[PDB]
Write a protein that binds this ligand. Structure first.
Ligand SMILES: N[C@@H](CC(=O)N1CCCCCN1C(=O)c1ccccc1)Cc1cc(F)c(F)cc1F
Ligand SMILES: N[C@@H](CC(=O)N1CCCCCN1C(=O)c1ccccc1)Cc1cc(F)c(F)cc1F
Lengths: 726, 728
């Protein structure tokens, strides 16, 4: 009777989720990439027009992987020769096409191996980074102006982030921010001169005779950190004369006293820029608000405008201090910050008034501020039904905080409990995106009335296909631990009979401020495990998890590898007694932080797990990068937290692996969690004589994401799970 | 009923083979280390005396791992702070103890981190190498004389070999040879300046924050090779004046025309040194014989004394040209070289007469020349019973080649078919060492009559223990392939019943000039597999194997990865039809070259094997070192042999692993077969989508020999074999 969602269905993508990625180019229209051609839509009525033909670039000779249309609509940026670097960085080649004259610009071309390119927010200026230096192009076909002269590979970074700032703070390679009307181009500069280098072999294609040694400036816990400087250049004064003058914005003095980080940059108006700085001990941050001094030429940040955000229970912000959203005139702003009760809510600030006023409150949290008009502030929160794993769009009346309206809650409560949104330029319209618990549903709305204009994509195609297959169901609920509730989720096999006993796989991540129990619909490896292998796949959010208040999130401050691993153990202990769970067949797996936790759990000696898999695990915190590790662990010095750094390694628990079956997997070219970390785990297991399974993936990084490696690791892990369970 | 030889018995060494390692210090006495104390024995009667007390070094503060007594008997060299490097090289600290005055010498001490130390053959001079430079000490307590000033880590090596000369040509770190009475100290110097570097990560103890990158000058196939120079210094002219004058011995011109290697140095008399040179294409070698010119001060090598040794079927020598054994006056010498029929035999040379005369002949081979007197030449060969896997000591009368006597053959034919020997200084006595098929047996003999003086060690202790356990048996036999015989051996489970069907594990190495089928008694992993798991463990010697003549050994010249892998397949195919072998459960494993072969066999598509294990395998020849690879494969250039270099990779056979269960294992710090090789195998397997098992050993090298790693790999492989055979 009917088939199931098989491993091959997962690996080969037989059932695909349709999306509807649009890009607003104004307050009334958006672009819609349609594989071949790019269309422009009228939000109000839904009528479209071909903006760019599929055939426009046949005889280009190069495969284009992406394109960027100037705010103007006058030019289009073509990206090709894409070569991936880290999680966000990459280099490519670029050609600009003039839509005014259907020509391909041929002069003063952007160099090959360009590191980053971006239009100004208005008109058609360009800033790009090449050989670590910043360049500006006022017109697509005119010579470009060199802004920085200090770029040097692996040493001086202008306009682009070094390894740790990319991964841990800006989640981007770009370190340059244009002012709203494009007059100013602000940028950061990173000096990695004394940052040690992580080195590892990269074998490359078979033809390479000698393996290459990759070296990337990467500061591990407690090591020397990159240093940073911020600058602002006026792109209307480049003219031709001499080298552009970049005005630096320094300090704050409370930051200069020791190591610190630049952690946010947000333009407030044409002449006001805000900056957030974080001390190396990340429980204290400062926001400066700097104004352009037309007579002086410099930028001054009035101490009256300085705001301090600190924490006494932990670090500041979910992963870094949140970003400010300024009102039109730039004299006030809204920002998500922790409550006195420990819940993240929106607080209203006057740029020159120290105390703010919360506009939202309650035991739930604002996930993020989505749009600000002079009337309303739109935000996403998990307030609805009191479930931390749901997401809904709300709007709050700026003149009366009592008038808060939920805009997504009731649209289709059965199928939609997790939304994200995308507003037009002046928030006249917004696209709601529901991604669970039912199939994704994309809709378009107009802010004046909040009425739904139409359904953009309802995934009906996928729906027809999935009713021919025995799909698994998902249960989102909670259990109680010491007077506080903790949520969990279970992917249940089809025709789940609580009478029968099922094996159970604990899918874990559990890093600080994470969430594995939610209402999102997913087609993944767990779908296959439940549907075909009839394995229940659970996830639990214990101490340390986020979106539930600092009492739960900061529970692991300076204590990684303790409560989050114990709560995973307690959850499974509780699941085993549920009645539909086979005690004798409970397993655990995780990737990255999940791998760390999975390994700490298997070596805890609990005896609750038969077997487990850890993919690219951290094994000891001194091996991970400073910005992340230190944020939760402090410095690994005897005066600070070295003792716990030493008490929380997977290696120290080697002996207890005797009791379980373990699968350790790691990519050899992992630039993030160095192969080193699993190399030390295997060496410790060998030293006490415990047998285990292993698999290395040659040249794969932290994502083990090449087509073949991805297929191979899941296939390998599937064999492992079925064997431990049958 | 009784126990078996278990995996734990192997990993924990519960049944140990006793040895009797002696060291001759004269023609009448030898030393015998007895854990605590070192004794000196009188060969004639067997009476001993305590030479050095166990307690002599209690308050030394350092654990001593070895010691060397000067030829004199006057001093003793103490080795401590031993830190291993490659297969033979290491650094250590040294202290000299004066036995004349029971004192520990405290002045002008040998440096810490010394790379190599050796007494002169006579008296008590010392030569040692430190920071790549040569030093000489005329007296243990006097300032030493710096001989070389060019040493530079990883670049210029004086008196010590670089990585490839250590592994492939001299099998030692030492590159210095004293003359017979210690007057001259000859040495080689290696320049690795343009040799590329192999680089790999070394993780070290957990406390290392950032992994270290090791880099060692290592020339892969076809790359730039180290260059070499030979020198001779007179240690009686060091006196104090100035820097010692080292006299260089160059050429031969037939060698200087291109890349070449220094491949042997053998002193002939107090003033005559011989040297063998090998061209980079290793089918041609030249021997120079150089005499000290007292008036000139230099060394001249008379072209009349030059001898060429070349091969048209393959390379020269088993692994390099063999070494000469000179007669008293140094005007003649005996050397093992290939026959016109292709068999290695002893031939007699006049230093200035071009054509030699073979003194042994037949379809068997002389393994090595063991001792030369004015009367007789003592040698080891596999002549007896026509079995290439046996070893016996023979003596041939130098005045009449017809009088050859076998000295070991009949001593104990049932238990002993594999001997090695150790002669005293002037061959007055010799120690025979039997290592199979029965338990090892060590005996002492006197050459005058060849009578047995006494049994030194008969392993009776082990014998008592082994009769309480169900030990396996060993069968040495042959099968015929295309009119020629090929030997094999099988470790058979106890109470073997040819009626029952047994799973069979093919244990393979099969590199050029190797031999896995022999009469040696062994206690290893195969003993456990047969005794406890009742698995038959076989080994076969096919084309390319040695000790059976060049027709078989050179069969793979320029053709690695072809006939030796095919013959392994044919052997297993034949074994599967034997009647006591289960077709459905045949597996294969090998280490190193064995790993390469095992992988080529599993990827051949034969279907004969269900599963197999490859430990530290070579995967493509361009990744291995020049001296070894090129010897059998030529240069990897289109004009030469690049096509076969490309046709013989494990990676190209990836698709055929779909049919088998494969276990790939490699040490991440393997400086010999770089992890790189298995990294390319796994990446090729992943690319065609074939599932397999893997295990990396952090910081372990080509031997995966630390105590814990050794135990862990055998345990892991045992689980894999039992599961593939459906036991447990
Ligand atoms: N440093 C972590 C950054 C991180 O958690 N990010 C990026 C910064 C914003 C916070 C959310 N997070 C996401 O980018 C993300 C990263 C990794 C898994 C899921 C989601 C990445 C990370 C943490 C670890 F504990 C690992 F071992 C591996 C890893 F990549
Ligand atoms: N290069 C080889 C040197 C070698 O065979 N030696 C050293 C030089 C004298 C000839 C005999 N041989 C011995 O040292 C020895 C080494 C290894 C196994 C058996 C015997 C070593 C070797 C060859 C390979 F094909 C491997 F992949 C690994 C390896 F160690």
């Amino acid at each position: 009777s009917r088939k199931t969602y098989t491993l091959t269905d997962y690996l080969k993508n037989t059932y695909r989720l349709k999306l509807y990625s649009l890009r607003w180019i104004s307050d009334h229209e958006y672009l819609y990439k349609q594989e071949n051609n790019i269309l422009v839509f009228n939000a109000e009525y839904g009528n479209s027009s071909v903006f760019l033909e599929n055939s426009t670039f046949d005889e280009f000779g190069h495969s284009i992987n992406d394109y960027s249309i100037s705010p103007d609509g006058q030019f289009i940026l073509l990206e090709y020769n894409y070569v991936k670097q880290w999680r966000h960085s990459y280099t490519a080649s670029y050609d600009i096409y003039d839509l005014n004259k259907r020509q391909l610009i041929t002069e003063e071309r952007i160099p090959n191996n360009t590191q980053w390119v971006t239009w100004s927010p208005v008109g058609h200026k360009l800033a790009y980074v090449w050989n670590n230096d910043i360049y500006v192009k006022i017109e697509p076909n005119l010579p470009s102006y060199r802004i920085t002269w200090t770029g040097k590979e692996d040493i001086i970074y202008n306009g682009i982030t070094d390894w740790v700032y990319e991964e841990e703070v800006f989640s981007a390679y770009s370190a340059l921010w244009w002012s709203p009307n494009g007059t100013f181009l602000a940028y950061a500069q990173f000096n990695d001169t004394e940052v040690p280098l992580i080195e590892y072999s990269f074998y490359s294609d078979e033809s390479l005779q000698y393996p290459k040694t990759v070296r990337v400036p990467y500061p591990k816990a407690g090591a020397v950190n990159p240093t940073v400087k911020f600058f602002v250049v006026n792109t209307d004064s480049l003219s031709s004369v001499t080298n552009a003058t970049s005005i630096q914005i320094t300090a704050p003095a409370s930051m200069l006293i020791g190591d610190h980080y630049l952690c946010d940059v947000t333009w407030a108006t044409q002449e006001r820029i805000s900056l957030q700085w974080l001390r190396r001990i990340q429980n204290y941050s400062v926001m400066d608000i700097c104004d352009y001094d037309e007579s002086s030429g410099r930028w001054n940040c009035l101490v009256a405008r300085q705001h301090i955000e600190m924490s006494t229970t932990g670090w500041v912000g979910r992963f870094r201090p949140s970003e400010p959203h300024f009102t039109l005139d730039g004299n006030s702003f809204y920002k998500i910050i922790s409550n006195e009760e420990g819940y993240r809510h929106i607080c209203y600030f006057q740029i020159d008034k120290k105390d703010c006023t919360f506009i939202t409150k309650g035991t739930w949290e604002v996930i993020g501020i989505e749009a600000l008009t002079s009337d309303y502030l739109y935000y996403i929160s998990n307030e609805y039904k009191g479930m931390p794993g749901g997401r809904n769009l709300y709007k709050i009346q700026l003149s009366d905080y009592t008038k808060v309206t939920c805009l997504s809650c009731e649209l289709n409560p059965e199928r939609c409990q997790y939304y994200s949104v995308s507003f037009s330029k002046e928030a006249k319209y917004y696209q709601l995106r529901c991604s669970g618990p039912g199939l994704p549903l994309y809709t378009l709305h107009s802010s004046v009335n909040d009425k739904g204009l139409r359904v953009l994509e309802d995934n009906s195609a996928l729906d027809k296909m999935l009713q021919n297959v025995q799909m698994p169901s998902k249960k989102l609920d909670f259990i109680i631990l010491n007077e506080t509730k903790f949520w969990y989720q279970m992917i249940l096999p089809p025709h789940f009979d609580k009478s029968k006993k099922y094996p159970l796989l604990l899918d874990v991540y559990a890093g600080p401020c994470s969430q594995k129990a939610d209402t999102v619909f997913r087609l993944n490896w767990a779908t296959y495990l439940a549907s075909t292998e009839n394995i229940i796949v659970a996830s639990f959010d214990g101490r340390g998890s986020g979106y539930q208040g600092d009492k739960i999130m900061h529970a692991i401050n300076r204590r990684l590898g303790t409560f989050e691993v114990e709560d995973q153990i307690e959850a499974a202990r509780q699941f085993s007694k549920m009645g539909f769970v086979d005690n004798k067949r409970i397993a655990i797996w995780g990737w990255s932080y999940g791998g760390y936790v999975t390994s700490m759990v298997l070596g805890s000696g609990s005896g609750v797990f038969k077997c487990g898999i850890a993919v690219a695990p951290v094994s000891r915190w001194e091996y991970y990068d400073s910005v992340y590790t230190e944020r939760y662990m402090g410095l690994p010095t005897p005066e600070d937290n070295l003792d716990h750094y030493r008490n929380s390694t997977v290696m120290s628990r080697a002996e207890n692996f005797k009791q379980v079956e373990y699968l350790l997997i790691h990519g050899t070219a992992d630039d993030n969690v160095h192969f080193q970390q699993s190399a030390q785990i295997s060496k410790a297991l060998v030293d006490v004589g415990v047998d285990f399974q292993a698999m290395w993936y040659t040249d794969e990084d932290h994502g083990i994401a090449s087509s073949t490696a991805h297929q191979h690791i899941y296939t390998h892990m599937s064999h492992f799970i079925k064997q431990c369970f049958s």
